[PDB]
Design a binder for this molecule. Sequence first.
Ligand SMILES: [Mg+2]
Length: 246
Amino acid sequence: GMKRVLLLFDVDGTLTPPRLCQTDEMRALIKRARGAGFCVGTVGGSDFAKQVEQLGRDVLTQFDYVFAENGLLAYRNGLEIHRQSLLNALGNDRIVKFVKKTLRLIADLDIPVQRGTFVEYRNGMINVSPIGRNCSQAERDEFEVYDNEHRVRASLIAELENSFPDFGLKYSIGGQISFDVFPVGWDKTYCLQFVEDDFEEIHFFGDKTQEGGNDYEIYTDKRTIGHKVTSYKDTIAEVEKIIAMK
Ligand SMILES: [Mg+2]
Protein backbone atom coordinates (compact mmCIF):
# COMPACT_ATOMS: atom_id res chain seq x y z
CA GLY A 1 0.00 0.00 0.00
CA MET A 2 0.81 3.70 0.34
CA LYS A 3 3.90 4.23 2.55
CA ARG A 4 2.66 7.38 4.33
CA VAL A 5 5.99 8.87 3.27
CA LEU A 6 6.30 12.16 1.45
CA LEU A 7 9.36 13.02 -0.66
CA LEU A 8 9.52 16.82 -0.96
CA PHE A 9 11.83 18.32 -3.60
CA ASP A 10 13.33 21.60 -4.55
CA VAL A 11 13.04 22.22 -8.31
CA ASP A 12 16.05 23.84 -10.06
CA GLY A 13 19.26 21.92 -9.31
CA THR A 14 17.36 19.21 -7.32
CA LEU A 15 14.88 17.91 -9.90
CA THR A 16 16.55 19.54 -12.88
CA PRO A 17 20.01 20.27 -14.34
CA PRO A 18 20.93 23.88 -13.49
CA ARG A 19 18.42 26.25 -15.19
CA LEU A 20 17.10 23.46 -17.50
CA CYS A 21 13.95 21.30 -17.89
CA GLN A 22 13.64 18.06 -15.87
CA THR A 23 15.15 15.14 -17.80
CA ASP A 24 13.50 11.85 -18.79
CA GLU A 25 15.31 9.92 -16.04
CA MET A 26 14.03 12.36 -13.45
CA ARG A 27 10.40 11.85 -14.64
CA ALA A 28 10.93 8.07 -14.55
CA LEU A 29 12.33 8.08 -11.02
CA ILE A 30 9.37 10.18 -9.81
CA LYS A 31 6.88 7.72 -11.38
CA ARG A 32 8.76 4.76 -9.83
CA ALA A 33 8.61 6.39 -6.36
CA ARG A 34 4.88 7.05 -6.80
CA GLY A 35 4.51 3.48 -8.10
CA ALA A 36 6.21 2.25 -4.90
CA GLY A 37 3.68 4.02 -2.62
CA PHE A 38 5.50 7.30 -1.90
CA CYS A 39 3.92 10.67 -2.22
CA VAL A 40 6.05 13.26 -4.04
CA GLY A 41 5.90 17.03 -3.83
CA THR A 42 7.65 20.11 -5.07
CA VAL A 43 8.58 23.19 -3.15
CA GLY A 44 10.13 26.32 -4.62
CA GLY A 45 10.54 29.97 -3.99
CA SER A 46 9.47 30.56 -7.61
CA ASP A 47 5.93 30.89 -8.95
CA PHE A 48 3.73 28.13 -10.30
CA ALA A 49 4.51 29.28 -13.89
CA LYS A 50 8.22 28.56 -13.33
CA GLN A 51 7.47 25.01 -12.18
CA VAL A 52 5.34 24.47 -15.30
CA GLU A 53 8.31 25.70 -17.36
CA GLN A 54 10.92 23.44 -15.79
CA LEU A 55 8.69 20.40 -15.06
CA GLY A 56 5.86 20.49 -17.59
CA ARG A 57 2.31 21.70 -18.17
CA ASP A 58 1.02 18.59 -16.35
CA VAL A 59 3.00 19.23 -13.15
CA LEU A 60 -0.19 18.79 -11.06
CA THR A 61 -0.52 15.25 -12.53
CA GLN A 62 3.10 14.38 -11.92
CA PHE A 63 3.20 15.32 -8.23
CA ASP A 64 1.00 14.72 -5.21
CA TYR A 65 1.85 18.16 -3.82
CA VAL A 66 2.91 21.31 -5.62
CA PHE A 67 4.06 24.16 -3.37
CA ALA A 68 4.76 27.37 -5.26
CA GLU A 69 6.04 30.56 -3.52
CA ASN A 70 7.16 28.38 -0.55
CA GLY A 71 3.63 26.84 -0.19
CA LEU A 72 1.99 30.29 -0.15
CA LEU A 73 0.14 28.79 -3.13
CA ALA A 74 -0.46 25.09 -2.44
CA TYR A 75 -1.89 22.19 -4.44
CA ARG A 76 -2.80 18.67 -3.41
CA ASN A 77 -3.43 16.21 -6.27
CA GLY A 78 -4.71 18.89 -8.60
CA LEU A 79 -6.79 20.76 -6.00
CA GLU A 80 -5.73 24.23 -4.86
CA ILE A 81 -5.72 23.90 -1.07
CA HIS A 82 -4.24 27.23 -0.01
CA ARG A 83 -3.56 30.69 -1.42
CA GLN A 84 -2.08 33.26 0.92
CA SER A 85 -2.08 37.06 0.44
CA LEU A 86 0.76 39.40 1.39
CA LEU A 87 -1.91 42.03 2.21
CA ASN A 88 -2.89 39.69 5.07
CA ALA A 89 0.53 40.06 6.75
CA LEU A 90 1.77 43.49 5.67
CA GLY A 91 -1.14 45.56 4.46
CA ASN A 92 -1.44 48.11 1.71
CA ASP A 93 0.40 51.11 3.18
CA ARG A 94 3.59 49.08 3.92
CA ILE A 95 3.52 47.25 0.60
CA VAL A 96 3.32 50.57 -1.27
CA LYS A 97 6.16 52.00 0.88
CA PHE A 98 8.31 48.95 0.16
CA VAL A 99 7.74 48.78 -3.63
CA LYS A 100 8.36 52.54 -3.97
CA LYS A 101 11.76 52.29 -2.26
CA THR A 102 12.68 49.17 -4.24
CA LEU A 103 11.86 50.90 -7.55
CA ARG A 104 14.13 53.90 -6.67
CA LEU A 105 17.02 51.64 -5.68
CA ILE A 106 16.71 49.66 -8.93
CA ALA A 107 16.50 52.84 -11.02
CA ASP A 108 19.81 53.94 -9.39
CA LEU A 109 21.69 50.84 -10.45
CA ASP A 110 24.53 50.87 -12.96
CA ILE A 111 24.43 47.38 -14.40
CA PRO A 112 24.91 46.42 -18.02
CA VAL A 113 21.32 45.30 -18.76
CA GLN A 114 17.86 46.21 -17.48
CA ARG A 115 14.57 45.15 -19.03
CA GLY A 116 11.25 44.74 -17.22
CA THR A 117 9.42 43.12 -14.24
CA PHE A 118 11.76 44.41 -11.57
CA VAL A 119 9.18 44.13 -8.77
CA GLU A 120 6.85 41.18 -9.00
CA TYR A 121 3.93 40.99 -6.60
CA ARG A 122 2.93 37.33 -6.22
CA ASN A 123 0.53 35.71 -3.86
CA GLY A 124 2.26 35.87 -0.51
CA MET A 125 5.61 37.41 -1.52
CA ILE A 126 7.32 40.01 -3.65
CA ASN A 127 10.16 39.00 -5.96
CA VAL A 128 12.76 41.66 -6.77
CA SER A 129 15.05 41.55 -9.89
CA PRO A 130 17.77 44.20 -10.60
CA ILE A 131 17.85 43.18 -14.27
CA GLY A 132 14.11 42.39 -14.55
CA ARG A 133 12.42 39.00 -15.09
CA ASN A 134 11.68 39.91 -18.72
CA CYS A 135 15.31 39.49 -19.78
CA SER A 136 16.38 36.61 -22.09
CA GLN A 137 18.02 33.35 -20.87
CA ALA A 138 21.45 34.57 -22.05
CA GLU A 139 20.91 37.85 -20.20
CA ARG A 140 20.05 35.81 -17.07
CA ASP A 141 23.31 33.85 -17.36
CA GLU A 142 25.23 37.08 -17.73
CA PHE A 143 23.51 38.86 -14.86
CA GLU A 144 24.26 35.81 -12.63
CA VAL A 145 28.00 36.10 -13.47
CA TYR A 146 27.86 39.85 -12.94
CA ASP A 147 26.07 39.50 -9.64
CA ASN A 148 28.65 36.89 -8.49
CA GLU A 149 31.31 39.56 -9.01
CA HIS A 150 29.52 42.76 -7.95
CA ARG A 151 26.95 41.36 -5.44
CA VAL A 152 24.21 43.61 -6.74
CA ARG A 153 21.39 41.61 -5.12
CA ALA A 154 23.16 41.67 -1.73
CA SER A 155 23.67 45.47 -1.89
CA LEU A 156 20.03 45.91 -2.75
CA ILE A 157 18.86 43.65 0.12
CA ALA A 158 21.26 45.49 2.45
CA GLU A 159 19.74 48.87 1.50
CA LEU A 160 16.18 47.48 1.88
CA GLU A 161 17.04 46.05 5.33
CA ASN A 162 18.31 49.54 6.35
CA SER A 163 15.17 51.24 5.05
CA PHE A 164 12.71 48.78 6.59
CA PRO A 165 14.14 47.01 9.66
CA ASP A 166 10.76 47.17 11.46
CA PHE A 167 8.96 45.43 8.53
CA GLY A 168 10.44 42.16 9.77
CA LEU A 169 10.83 40.81 6.22
CA LYS A 170 13.12 38.02 5.13
CA TYR A 171 15.17 38.46 1.95
CA SER A 172 16.05 35.33 0.17
CA ILE A 173 18.30 35.16 -2.85
CA GLY A 174 17.32 32.37 -5.27
CA GLY A 175 17.98 31.46 -8.90
CA GLN A 176 19.92 33.69 -11.30
CA ILE A 177 18.42 37.20 -11.18
CA SER A 178 16.25 37.89 -8.12
CA PHE A 179 15.41 37.51 -4.47
CA ASP A 180 12.12 36.79 -2.72
CA VAL A 181 10.85 38.99 0.08
CA PHE A 182 8.30 37.73 2.61
CA PRO A 183 7.31 37.86 6.30
CA VAL A 184 9.44 35.88 8.76
CA GLY A 185 7.88 32.38 8.79
CA TRP A 186 6.76 32.38 5.14
CA ASP A 187 10.00 30.60 4.12
CA LYS A 188 9.79 27.04 2.70
CA THR A 189 8.77 25.58 6.09
CA TYR A 190 5.43 27.31 5.40
CA CYS A 191 4.38 24.34 3.24
CA LEU A 192 4.75 21.81 6.10
CA GLN A 193 1.55 22.91 7.85
CA PHE A 194 -0.30 21.28 4.86
CA VAL A 195 1.32 17.81 5.07
CA GLU A 196 2.59 17.32 8.69
CA ASP A 197 -0.56 15.54 9.85
CA ASP A 198 -0.68 13.21 6.81
CA PHE A 199 2.76 11.47 6.66
CA GLU A 200 4.83 9.45 9.12
CA GLU A 201 7.97 10.77 7.39
CA ILE A 202 8.65 13.79 5.24
CA HIS A 203 12.03 13.72 3.42
CA PHE A 204 13.24 17.07 2.11
CA PHE A 205 15.81 17.32 -0.77
CA GLY A 206 17.54 20.61 -1.62
CA ASP A 207 20.90 22.25 -2.18
CA LYS A 208 20.91 25.53 -0.23
CA THR A 209 20.77 24.00 3.21
CA GLN A 210 22.98 26.30 5.31
CA GLU A 211 22.57 29.62 7.14
CA GLY A 212 21.29 32.16 4.56
CA GLY A 213 20.34 29.47 2.01
CA ASN A 214 16.73 29.33 0.82
CA ASP A 215 16.52 25.62 1.94
CA TYR A 216 17.95 26.17 5.48
CA GLU A 217 14.70 26.43 7.45
CA ILE A 218 12.98 23.50 5.71
CA TYR A 219 16.08 21.29 5.85
CA THR A 220 16.54 21.97 9.61
CA ASP A 221 12.82 21.75 10.49
CA LYS A 222 12.27 18.97 13.01
CA ARG A 223 9.40 17.73 10.82
CA THR A 224 11.71 16.83 7.89
CA ILE A 225 14.45 14.24 7.30
CA GLY A 226 16.90 16.45 5.35
CA HIS A 227 18.96 15.29 2.30
CA LYS A 228 21.45 17.83 1.04
CA VAL A 229 21.92 17.28 -2.70
CA THR A 230 24.31 18.88 -5.22
CA SER A 231 22.52 17.82 -8.42
CA TYR A 232 19.43 16.02 -9.68
CA LYS A 233 21.64 12.95 -10.12
CA ASP A 234 22.38 13.04 -6.40
CA THR A 235 18.58 13.25 -5.84
CA ILE A 236 17.92 10.20 -8.00
CA ALA A 237 20.59 8.10 -6.29
CA GLU A 238 19.27 8.94 -2.81
CA VAL A 239 15.64 8.32 -3.88
CA GLU A 240 16.76 4.94 -5.28
CA LYS A 241 17.93 4.02 -1.79
CA ILE A 242 14.69 5.17 -0.19
CA ILE A 243 12.78 3.03 -2.78
CA ALA A 244 15.04 0.00 -2.08
CA MET A 245 14.28 0.17 1.71
CA LYS A 246 10.56 0.54 0.85
MG1 LIG B 1 14.69 18.59 9.06
